[PDB]
Ligand binder design. Structure first.
Ligand SMILES: CC(C)(COP(=O)(O)OP(=O)(O)OC[C@H]1O[C@@H](n2cnc3c(N)ncnc32)[C@H](O)[C@@H]1OP(=O)(O)O)[C@@H](O)C(=O)NCCC(=O)NCCSC(=O)CSCC(=O)O
Ligand SMILES: Cc1cc2nc3c(=O)[nH]c(=O)nc-3n(C[C@H](O)[C@H](O)[C@H](O)COP(=O)(O)OP(=O)(O)OC[C@H]3O[C@@H](n4cnc5c(N)ncnc54)[C@H](O)[C@@H]3O)c2cc1C
Length: 390
């Protein structure tokens, strides 16, 4: 008995579909992504095909019913992310934006005209989208964003002016989901397309985290958005925050895939590498580290499963997601760091991958709410007292 690869038997907790969905995607991730990550990460190269590839597999926007989507469970969504991050966080990051930050909002806040126009193409990966909320001056405080949208009564359009930075996929994006403060204090979502005059999405350089992922800006020089490109179901931060909750859930699951890759690598290395006439795995210090990695991964996995089930029941709450995203991200960051240390000198070579995961999880622990921000959200939901500001 006892399989360190699933010590608490999560396998018998998944339906046959979820399992088939996972292993199918896993064969792809290992066949089509794993062999390209080394150089993709080393030379910051994100192959656009990837999206097309994932789209035609139906892993894009999988919980959406109809519109060309898979219409699967939240758990299945988690399993998918996990398999992707097991390869690289960048990839998963591109897949999470597409699914939870582009399609979801279109589907839930958009009109039927937009749902029809965009959903099918995204689901197929024929349209790479991006989510623009963050601005050079607005990170943890999206309510201070400066991008403004001016309503033009004559043609019922909006003229957006602002700058979104640190936007995943913006550089090679076709569709843009920008959030801007309107002249009445409310904030609505605006669908922008590549080509619109006044719209540039330059790529950010010098990244030492999520390098295989294209990141850039969304500079809007008085871009005019038609009446039909405004998101009908928007009003204040609630809109992007609802999409965030979906994305954070995918991340909570994703980082577990990363932690697992590092455990496996460190464990295997601990077995093959010989020092002092024995494998490193014979040493107590080495064994305790393996014990901690497996311990946390396990705690996170089963917690994520329970959140999957609650999500599909619609009993899932926002602060639940904060708790796991925050937990899993920090815990995964440490696991990657330990594995790096456990491989000694070789650990600092991207050819041993652990370093790539340690660098990647640095960013993941920051976006979608920093570790401390999720501390304050949880803290506020516990005490009933706000402590973000003074
Ligand atoms: C929430 C906040 C901004 C705190 O600000 P606050 O003003 O005090 O928040 P708050 O007190 O919440 O007041 C503001 C408004 O937000 C509402 N709200 C909160 N959670 C919601 C949810 N789940 N669904 C719908 N609405 C929600 C809230 O009730 C109110 O709206 P309304 O009722 O309509 O009046 C902060 O805790 C936070 O979330 N900071 C994080 C910044 C952030 O959102 N970063 C993510 C950007 S995207 C990204 O990083 C993608 S990375 C790519 C990848 O996947 O790899
Ligand atoms: C690779 C990558 C991809 C990204 N992709 C996207 C994307 O597609 N879309 C998007 O909208 N955003 C995206 N982001 C941005 C990310 O969501 C934000 O960076 C993050 O939410 C806030 O960080 P910031 O850079 O503004 O830092 P800041 O908000 O300036 O925060 C900095 C530090 O201060 C702390 N802090 C902040 N406020 C408080 C407070 N009140 N009390 C106590 N401590 C506080 C935090 O712990 C954090 O460590 C991306 C970022 C990276 C690194």
């Amino acid at each position: 008995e006892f399989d360190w690869q699933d010590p608490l038997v999560l396998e018998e907790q998944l339906t046959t579909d979820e399992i088939l969905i996972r292993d199918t995607f896993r064969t792809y991730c290992q066949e089509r992504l794993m062999p390209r990550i080394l150089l993709a990460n080393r030379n910051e190269v994100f192959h656009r095909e990837i999206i097309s590839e994932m789209g035609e597999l139906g892993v894009l926007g999988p919980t959406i019913k109809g519109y060309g989507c898979a219409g699967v469970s939240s758990v299945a969504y988690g399993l998918l992310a996990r398999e992707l991050e097991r390869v690289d966080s960048g990839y998963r990051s591109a897949m999470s934006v597409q699914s939870s930050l582009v399609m979801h909002p279109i589907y839930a806040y958009g009109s039927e005209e937009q749902r029809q126009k965009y959903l099918p193409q995204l689901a197929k990966g024929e349209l790479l989208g991006c989510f623009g909320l963050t601005e050079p001056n607005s990170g943890s405080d999206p309510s201070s964003m400066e991008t403004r949208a001016h309503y033009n009564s004559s043609n019922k359009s909006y003229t957006l002016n602002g700058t979104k930075t640190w936007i995943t996929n913006s550089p090679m994006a076709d569709l843009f989901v920008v959030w801007a403060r309107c002249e009445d204090g409310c904030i609505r979502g605006f669908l922008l397309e590549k080509g619109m005059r006044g719209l540039s999405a330059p790529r950010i350089q010098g990244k030492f985290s999520l390098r295989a992922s294209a990141t850039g800006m969304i500079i809007m020089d008085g871009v005019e958005v038609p009446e039909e490109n405004v998101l009908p179901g928007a009003s204040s931060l609630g809109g992007p925050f609802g999409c965030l909750n979906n994305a954070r859930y995918g991340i909570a699951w994703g980082v577990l895939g990363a932690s697992e890759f590092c455990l496996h690598t460190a464990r295997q290395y601990a077995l093959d590498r010989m020092q002092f006439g024995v494998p490193l795995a014979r040493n107590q210090l080495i064994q305790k580290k393996l014990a901690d990695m497996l311990t946390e991964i396990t705690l996170g996995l089963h917690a994520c499963l329970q959140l999957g089930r609650l999500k599909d029941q619609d009993k899932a709450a926002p602060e639940m997601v904060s708790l796991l995203k925050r937990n899993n991200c920090g815990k995964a960051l440490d696991i990657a760091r330990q594995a790096r240390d456990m491989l000694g000198g070789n650990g600092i070579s991207d050819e041993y991958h652990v370093i790539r995961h340690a660098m990647n999880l640095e960013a993941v622990n920051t976006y979608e709410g920093t570790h401390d921000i999720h501390a304050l959200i949880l803290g506020r939901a516990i005490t009933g007292i706000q402590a973000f500001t003074a």
